Ligand SMILES: CN(C)C(=O)Nc1ccc(Cl)c(Cl)c1
């Protein structure tokens with residue numbers, strides 16, 4: 001309510017919500033899973049004070065944005081085309097796209113398929129992986145044992161039941177520092193699911209407060225986890241769309257920000273990205289887990305502003 | 314509306330302001346008049362955005378999707394201006410160019426007077442800047458010129474509301490007309506019954522508007538009615554008292570005064586000697602242009618606004 005709330009209808013059933021702060025070049029912030037525009041809480045005033053027009057999104061299936069139950073509505077192709085329509089209705093020819101996690105995956109696809117609409121691209125934790133035309137996306141998940149949670153997120157209604165059971169428990173178990181993390185994502189089920197080692201009433205992490213956790217709880221009461229989980233349920237569709245580009249390079253200015261303690265989106269996954277992205281710049285945050293914006297907000301703000309002032313402007 | 318980006322800012326616990334947003338560049342805040350909408354800037358919105366400006370076309374307090382409290386005090390220039398400051402604060406805008414028409418034009422002058430640090434540049438269509446006379450009554454100023462008789466008719470709450478809400482399609486078809494098509498006789502609102510006495514039950518469509526454009530204003534005014542819009546007129550003494558607190562000071566920021574040759578209420582002669590109080594004042598004049606400036610001559614408005622923005626606001 002201290003924020004300016006924007007609403008853009010991209011499709012007759014799809015309406016995208018965003019918070020707006022500041023003046024200057026348009027900066028579109030895209031959150032990950034299971035997040036909110038609120039994940040960019042420390043970045044919003046910092047980027048606006050630096051001289052940028054901040055557009056922090058509530059991604060499709062999250063918060064005040066439309067959440068259709070259809071799985072097909074959450075493929076990279078549909079999501080990217082909606083983001084282009086979002087820019088068109090706002091009268092923006094270009095925008096700087098900064099994404100984290102699943103938002104980071106979206107921003108790379110936006111830079112690859114629509115470079116004329118992306119002034120500059122930045123990604124927190126998520127690397128740019130060029131699709132292998134000879135290897136199946138299911139084979140890539142099963143190769144590394146750490147991605148076992150993704151297979152558990154495939155069947156609709158299964159992960160939804162566990163994540164919606166107790167919202168306060170869900171966010172308190174997920175939004176933790178790496179040394180405070182008790183998640184065993186490498187071996188999901190036996191029965192317990194994602195939160196087996198986590199207790200019924202988990203302790204509050206050093207990054208978040210009770211008020212911050214309760215904000216995500218209220219937001220996820222509106223639509224649940226179906227929409228957010230459907231982002232994982234389009235692995236074959238996204239692989240086929242990424243194969244359509246093949247060989248082409250992202251020529252626009254780019255930033256890759258790696259997190260030292262992110263065990264799922266490891267910094268080593270970002271290697272050789274400069275071969276596919278010639279104008280790639282690098283950022284690295286030590287003592288930083290998966291929840292980059294929450295874990296090290298000061299380091300994120302400094303890295304983003306420095307790059308925006310030199311490469312995006 | 315469905316093709317537009319819709320923004321919402323809660324300025325007070327009971328007051329929420331709606332706006333349409335288009336383009337990138339310096340922030341340009343468009344403020345409509347009475348009994349209008351953000352839609353009155355329909356020709357200006359894509360034109361200023363294409364010219365390289367971030368357009369914020371307001372639904373003023375008491376109109377459309379914006380909050381409409383029944384209280385008269387909520388529509389005085391003091392409350393309205395403070396809410397616009399809060400609107401800029403929550404959007405993270407240090408400054409914005411303020412372009413107003415009619416009652417919105419009055420707002421932009423007060424915004425430039427009391428808050429010049431938040432106004433990059435000020436522009437007004439038809440509405441002049443008149444410094445309040447401390448030794449002259451506000452009620453006597455309206456009674457001096459016979460043309461402002463309709464304002465006295467707009468004072469009693471519920472009276473004008475009943476006539477304006479009776480038939481919304483008839484209301485907008487009788488008001489939104491060119492000067493040569495105008496059937497209104499606002500100088501004698503006492504002898505006859507209402508404002509639309511000379512107008513027929515089913516008035517003809519004006520050369521400036523289409524049937525679908527008239528239908529938009531009808532749908533918008535079904536939400537809150539005419540109480541909120543008419544309360545802008547019911548704060549004459551309160552607005553005069555606030556204007557007297559500034560007395561002596563000049564508007565030092567860049568300014569533009571756009572006069573309309575055929576506006577019989579906000580006559581171009583009312584804008585005379587404005588440069589004495591506004592040193593950096595620029596001028597614009599549209600011939601064959603009635604009260605509904607944006608509606609009447611859209612191409613002329615766009616050209617005058619773009620030329621002034623590129624030279625005085627940048
Ligand atoms: C494919 N991607 C980006 C993910 O699976 N990200 C992701 C998001 C949330 C969590 Cl809790 C985990 Cl372990 C990974």
Ligand SMILES: CN(C)C(=O)Nc1ccc(Cl)c(Cl)c1
Pocket residue numbers: 346347348415416419440463464488499578579
């Ligand atoms: C004090 N002002 C600006 C007005 O009374 N403006 C105004 C608005 C609408 C109409 Cl129909 C008329 Cl006659 C005057």
